Amino acid sequence: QTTATLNWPQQGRLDNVTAPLISQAPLELTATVPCSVVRDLPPEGGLVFGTAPAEGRDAALNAMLVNVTETRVDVIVRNVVVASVNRDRVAGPDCQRIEITSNLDGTYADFVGLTQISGEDAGKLQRTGYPDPNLRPAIVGVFTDLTGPA
The number of residues making up the chain comes to 150
Q: What method was applied to determine this entry?
A: cryo-EM
Domain count, the chain: 1
| Range list of H helices, the chain | 59-62, 87-90
| Range list of H helices, 7-107 | 59-62, 87-90
What is the Cα–Cα distance from 140 to 52, expressed in whole angstroms? 5
What is the Cα–Cα distance from 116 to 123, expressed in whole angstroms? 6
For 24-39, b/e burial (b = at least 16 CB within 10 A) is eebeebebebebeebe
User: Any idea of the CA torsion for 35, 26, 107, 52, to the nearest 10 degrees?
Assistant: 50
What residues pair up with 66 in beta bridges, in sequence order? 49, 75
What residues make up the domain containing 42?
Answer: 1-150
What is the Cα–Cα distance from 23 to 141, expressed in whole angstroms? 13
- What CATH number is associated with residue 150? 2.60.120.610
Q: What is the resolution of this structure in A?
A: 3.1
